[PDB]
Design a protein around this ligand. Structure first.
Ligand SMILES: Nc1nc2c(ncn2[C@@H]2O[C@H](COP(=O)(O)O)[C@@H](O)[C@H]2O)c(=O)[nH]1
Ligand SMILES: Nc1nc2c(ncn2[C@@H]2O[C@H](COP(=O)(O)O)[C@@H](O)[C@H]2O)c(=O)[nH]1
Ligand SMILES: Nc1nc2c(ncn2[C@@H]2O[C@H](COP(=O)(O)O)[C@@H](O)[C@H]2O)c(=O)[nH]1
Ligand SMILES: Nc1nc2c(ncn2[C@@H]2O[C@H](COP(=O)(O)O)[C@@H](O)[C@H]2O)c(=O)[nH]1
Ligand SMILES: Nc1nc2c(ncn2[C@@H]2O[C@H](COP(=O)(O)O)[C@@H](O)[C@H]2O)c(=O)[nH]1
Lengths: 304, 317
């Protein structure tokens, strides 16, 4: 029995909706190809329950899923099974707008109306790029996109594969742009999990040691990705970098992970210094050349 | 395990979709210790607007309303029907024949009027209680679900019952009996393969049903408290549906179907709930199906129940 019990009705509706749309899709045949109309398609469901099932869910709400054939195909190309995705969302309330599913596998971001417009704008090309690069990219992996109507209010959400591991504690993070100059404010330096920027990183002189093995794949990925973004005329995106220090965590194995689940994770080299696991991906792509070459060079000068 | 909701009419597709949907939702809703008054005024409602999606069998746009779902879930449970079975009976393949049967012939789906839905509501509390205290042992219709579908802005009301007839055993003759003081079948009806015969038809044939005394007593005790119950409410003009299954004739028919394709009379009393074998000293081996039908649509109730009762009691031996 899934109750869809959550801290807030919006979360309940999200759970119910992912459950309903995934189950509904299990009845829809996997097509031979996507069609143009699948990129303009949606499912809308409206619920009005009088005196029934009101313990966790509201009596009246709406749930809208954008382009469900497209995002279902994207899930497949990212190696994600529909039942696991459904399970991660519905087995237990997602947790702390920015949420994670209870198992930390998937991120759920509340976004604006124009974000959803922009997603419709890039979705065809993004899909075609995911096809051509065989799912091997550092771009956000867009798994689903929904609009919830609760208490008359519309809330838009986009679901991604988590950049960080769902298991390994991240010990310090960086939002890097390659840009100007930006750092962490005194108020930002106070949180246990601080978000550092380019200059903090550079001035710290901290490098990341993945060898020449991982460096190859990574840079080969990064260039194709930013070339794609530039071809779309998009900018202001970042490279999110997470660092998990193994010894500290230690103080069911240290540094042990399943690469097919922690897709962005990289082991520190042996000849390198301290022992770490790194997590690196491109975030916030929903908004030119200069930006791409610059970002690329900045991120390339971080791997030794 | 893919379910397509393929059907000849959008109405059937939506019915299959809605039963599938409501039963799956109910699986995520714990079973209460008891029912509460609100469950009798309760309903669920779902409105679907699909755009450029999932349009092969379902309409893009439709509505589905289930009346008092907690109550009907409970009534199913008291009638010895598992929710997954009910759902599979409705959704694995399209119901057939508005009068529908599920593809496996276990459940009957009747299209009713808005007034019929109204009357179900009026009587639902008392019907439930009566089902509680007679332990699901009744000749009354066994109500398993009530729905409203909206397709093309048009509303259709539907009530689901257990089939009076066997889901496997062929019916060879049927009567609708009231006990009214002239009720016969038209020359038109008589020209159907399976005519609905009536009182005077039953009487004139000298037809009897030989069930033997234990079965007869059980049946008559049921009939008695059932028709008293109906008399207590406003209810009049209901009927006893009677189906007769000829065992030998069926055996032969089976043999003939095999011969065609090439180029007993037992049954589960927990599934064919209205079925009685003939007395081991009957002129021929038969199986009978007997139950009360048409109790919703409502010389007065008391009188009617008394008469109906007398007549039905002189039907069998
Ligand atoms: N755990 C986790 N945090 C993320 C992820 N993406 C962005 N964040 C972080 O979440 C915060 C808000 O995200 P943003 O406003 O960029 O969407 C920032 O601190 C950002 O670094 C992710 O995929 N996983
Ligand atoms: N649509 C709707 N009709 C109702 C409701 N309650 C009673 N009715 C209908 O209103 C009429 C009178 O109901 P009463 O209150 O007299 O028993 C009947 O036709 C009955 O079916 C309700 O909650 N909704
Ligand atoms: N007594 C009663 N009648 C209802 C209720 N809901 C609907 N009805 C009756 O059922 C019929 C159809 O209702 P509708 O669901 O289309 O609003 C109408 O005759 C309406 O009055 C209810 O909760 N109680
Ligand atoms: N097979 C079957 N036929 C029924 C059942 N109830 C009613 N019928 C038949 O269906 C036709 C119309 O139903 P009614 O007008 O009673 O709703 C009549 O021929 C009637 O005898 C049932 O439970 N099973
Ligand atoms: N009562 C009865 N009729 C039979 C039997 N075998 C054949 N008949 C009938 O005799 C006719 C010829 O049957 P056929 O043998 O050509 O299938 C048909 O009317 C058929 O129903 C039987 O074993 N018992």
């Amino acid at each position: 029995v899934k109750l869809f019990r959550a801290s807030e009705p919006i979360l309940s509706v999200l759970m119910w909706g992912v459950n309903h749309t995934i189950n509904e899709l299990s009845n829809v045949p996997v097509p031979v190809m996507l069609m143009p109309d699948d990129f303009k398609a949606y499912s809308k469901i409206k619920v009005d329950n009088h005196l029934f099932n009101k313990e966790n869910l509201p009596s009246r709400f709406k749930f809208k899923e954008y382009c469900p054939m497209v995002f279902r195909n994207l899930r497949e190309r990212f190696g994600i099974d529909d039942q696991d995705y459904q399970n991660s969302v519905t087995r237990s309330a997602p947790i702390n707008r920015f949420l994670t599913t209870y198992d930390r596998r998937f991120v759920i971001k509340t976004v604006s109306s124009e974000d959803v417009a922009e997603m419709h704008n890039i979705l065809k090309k993004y899909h075609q790029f995911i096809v051509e690069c065989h799912g091997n990219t550092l771009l956000p992996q867009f798994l689903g996109m929904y609009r919830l109507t609760v208490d008359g209010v519309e809330t838009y959400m986009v679901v991604t594969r988590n950049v960080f591991s769902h298991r390994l504690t991240v010990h310090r993070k960086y939002d890097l742009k390659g840009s100007v100059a930006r750092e962490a404010s005194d108020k930002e330096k106070a949180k246990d999990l601080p978000t550092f920027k380019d200059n903090d990183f550079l001035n710290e002189g901290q490098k990341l040691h993945v060898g020449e093995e991982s460096k190859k794949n990574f840079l080969e990925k990064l260039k194709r990705d930013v070339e794609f973004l530039a071809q779309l005329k998009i900018m202001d995106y970042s490279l999110l970098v997470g660092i998990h220090d193994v010894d500290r965590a230690e103080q069911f194995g240290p540094g042990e992970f399943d690469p097919s689940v922690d897709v962005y994770a990289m082991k520190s080299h042996e000849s390198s210094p301290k022992k770490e696991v790194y997590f690196m991906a491109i975030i916030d792509i929903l908004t030119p050349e200069q930006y791409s070459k610059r970002f690329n060079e900045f991120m390339s000068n971080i791997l030794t």
